[PDB]
Design a protein around this ligand. Structure first.
Ligand SMILES: NC(=O)c1ccc[n+]([C@@H]2O[C@H](COP(=O)([O-])OP(=O)(O)OC[C@H]3O[C@@H](n4cnc5c(N)ncnc54)[C@H](OP(=O)(O)O)[C@@H]3O)[C@@H](O)[C@H]2O)c1
Ligand SMILES: NC(=O)c1ccc[n+]([C@@H]2O[C@H](COP(=O)([O-])OP(=O)(O)OC[C@H]3O[C@@H](n4cnc5c(N)ncnc54)[C@H](OP(=O)(O)O)[C@@H]3O)[C@@H](O)[C@H]2O)c1
Lengths: 255, 257
C-alpha cells in the first residue's frame, strides 16, 4: 500500500524546523506514529510540542534524544523507536550542520564535526534503516542544493553532504530487493534558523534573489512548507523514485 | 607570467613510491621536473620509495622520501613543511592516497567507516588545504578519485562515498585558489591493474571489470593501465592548466558523467 495508514515514521532532527513540520504533516495526512529524534537539550521543548501536535493530528508520538555521530547511538535510536512502536516503515534523516569559511582557514575540529554530522550520521542512519525497516519501507536523507553549485567557501559543507548522494545510490540497489525506496532531497537555502548564522548580509541578499521563483516564496528563500509535500510524496505514491538525489529549490541550482 | 613546462618545478606526491604515484614520479622527473618529494605510508613501501628516488635522480631531478600516516591534520601539515624545508618551494602537489572497501552496507563496521573516511576524505581535505597554504603561484593540485563516482551500483558505499567529497573540495578550491593562478583537478581512473584493486574484488567481479570498458580489448588486462593515466596527469600539470574545478574520468569507456 502507498498511503500513510498504519505507517510508523522515524525522523532524525524531527523536533523543529524542517523535521518538525514533516512530523506534523505526516501525522495530519494519516500516519500511525512518529518517533521524534532530537539532539541538543535546547531542542527538547520543541520536541515535546511537536509530539503534542502529532497527537492532536491523530497519531501516536514519542521523543528520543541522541547525538548521532557515533554508530552505536544510531543503532540505539532505531532499536528504541522500534521497541516503542513495534516497527519502522519510513525513516527520514534531517540531521546536518553548516560551515562557510575559506578552505585555508578550516580547522581539524571543524572538519571532524562537519563530517561526523553530515556524512557519518547519515551513513549509519542508512545502515540501520537497512537493518530495521519493514519491507516496502522508505529512506530519505536531506542534502543541499549546493551539490549543484560551483562556488567558494562551502568545501566542508558541500563536501560532507556529497557522500549521501552516493550512499543513496548504493542503498537503493542493495535495499530494493526488499521493496525499500531510498532518496536524497536537496533544498535551496531555507528560511530557518539553520541558514542565517553562516551568511552575511550580501550573501543573504544574493540567496534571496538567486532562485527563479524567489519572488513567490515568503522571503525569497526556500520555505519548509514547500519541501514537506515532496517528502510526503516520496514516502507515499512516489515510491518508484529511488536512487536519486533531487533538488527542490525554486530554480537555484540544477544537475 | 607562468611557464607551462616542468622546468624548475618541485613536485610533491602523496603515495609517490609505487604503483600510480611511483610512475608519476618517474614520468615527471623524466619530463624535466626539478625535484620530487616522494611520500609513502607503510614500512613495506620504504624500499620502493628509495628505488623511486634513485630513478628520479637518474632522470635528472633531485629526490627525497618522506614517511607519514596522513589521516591527521598535523601529519599533512608536517609533510608539506618537510618537503618545503628540503626543496624550498612546492609547485605541483599530487595526492594518490586512498583505500578501497567493497561490502554490503549492513556489514560495514564503525572502524571500517572511520578508516575509509580518514584516508579517502580527511587526508584529501587537508592535502588540498595545505596545498592552498604552500603552493607557489601558478601551481597545480591534483587528487585521485574513482570512476565509481559515475556508477549506480551496490557494495561501494564506503569507497564511492568517501571519494565523493574530493569532487566538491576540488570545486571550492578551484574557485578560491584561482586568484593565485593555481589549477585544481580530480582524476578518476577505471579499475586499474595494480595490487590496490584485486584484494577487494571477487573473481567474478574481476572478470566483469576486465570487460566493462568499451576499450577493454586494447589495454593489457582489460582494466585501466597506470601507463595510460600518467600522461593525462602530466598534461593537467603542464599545458592543460586551463582545466580547473573539474573531476574527470579516465577509464576506457567504463562510466561517464
Ligand atoms: N536551512 C537551510 O538553509 C538548509 C538548506 C539546504 C539543506 N538543508 C539541510 O536540511 C536539514 C534540516 O535543516 P533545518 O533548516 O531543518 O535546520 P535544523 O533544525 O538545525 O537541522 C539540523 C538538525 O541536525 C541536528 N544535529 C546536529 N548535530 C547533531 C548531532 N551530533 N547528532 C544528532 N543530530 C544533530 C540538529 O539538532 P540540534 O539543533 O538540537 O543540535 C537539528 O535537529 C539539514 O540536514 C540541513 O543540512 C538546510
Ligand atoms: N587501483 C585501482 O583499481 C584504482 C581505481 C580507481 C582509483 N584508484 C585510486 O588511485 C589511487 C592510487 O591507487 P594505486 O592503484 O596506485 O594503489 P596504491 O599504491 O595502493 O595507492 C594508495 C596509496 O595510499 C596510501 N595510504 C593508505 N593509507 C594511508 C595513510 N593512512 N596515510 C597515508 N597514505 C596512505 C598507500 O600507502 P601504503 O600502501 O604504503 O600504506 C598507497 O601509497 C588511490 O587513491 C585509489 O583510490 C585506484
Amino acid at each position: 500500500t502507498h498511503t500513510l495508514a498504519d505507517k510508523v515514521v522515524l525522523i532524525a532532527g524531527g523536533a523543529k524546523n524542517l523535521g518538525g513540520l514533516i512530523a506534523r504533516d505526516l501525522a495530519g495526512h494519516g500516519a500511525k506514529a512518529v518517533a521524534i529524534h532530537y539532539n541538543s537539550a535546547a531542542s527538547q521543548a520543541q520536541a515535546e510540542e511537536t509530539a503534542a501536535a502529532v497527537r492532536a493530528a491523530g497519531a501516536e508520538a514519542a521523543t528520543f534524544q541522541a547525538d548521532l555521530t557515533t554508530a552505536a547511538a544510531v543503532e540505539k535510536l532505531f532499536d528504541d523507536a522500534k521497541q516503542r512502536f513495534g516497527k519502522i516503515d519510513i525513516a527520514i534523516n534531517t540531521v546536518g550542520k553548516v560551515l562557510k569559511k575559506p578552505f585555508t582557514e578550516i580547522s581539524e575540529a571543524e572538519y571532524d564535526e562537519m563530517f561526523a554530522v553530515n556524512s557519518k550520521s547519515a551513513f549509519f542512519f542508512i545502515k540501520e534503516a537497512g537493518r530495521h525497516l519493514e519491507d516496502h519501507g522508505k529512506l530519505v536523507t536531506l542534502v543541499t542544493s549546493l551539490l549543484g553549485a560551483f562556488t567558494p567557501f562551502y568545501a566542508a559543507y558541500e563536501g560532507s553532504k556529497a557522500p549521501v548522494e552516493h550512499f543513496t545510490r548504493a542503498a537503493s540497489k542493495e535495499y530494493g530487493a526488499r521493496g525499500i525506496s531510498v532518496t536524497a532531497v536537496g533544498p535551496g537555502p531555507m528560511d530557518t534558523p539553520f541558514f542565517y548564522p553562516a551568511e552575511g548580509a550580501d550573501a543573504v541578499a544574493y540567496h534571496k534573489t538567486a532562485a527563479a521563483l524567489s519572488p513567490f516564496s515568503k522571503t525569497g528563500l526556500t520555505d519548509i512548507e514547500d519541501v514537506v509535500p515532496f517528502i510526503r510524496h516520496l514516502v507515499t505514491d512516489g515510491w518508484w523514485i529511488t536512487g536519486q538525489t533531487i533538488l527542490i529549490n525554486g530554480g537555484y541550482t540544477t544537475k
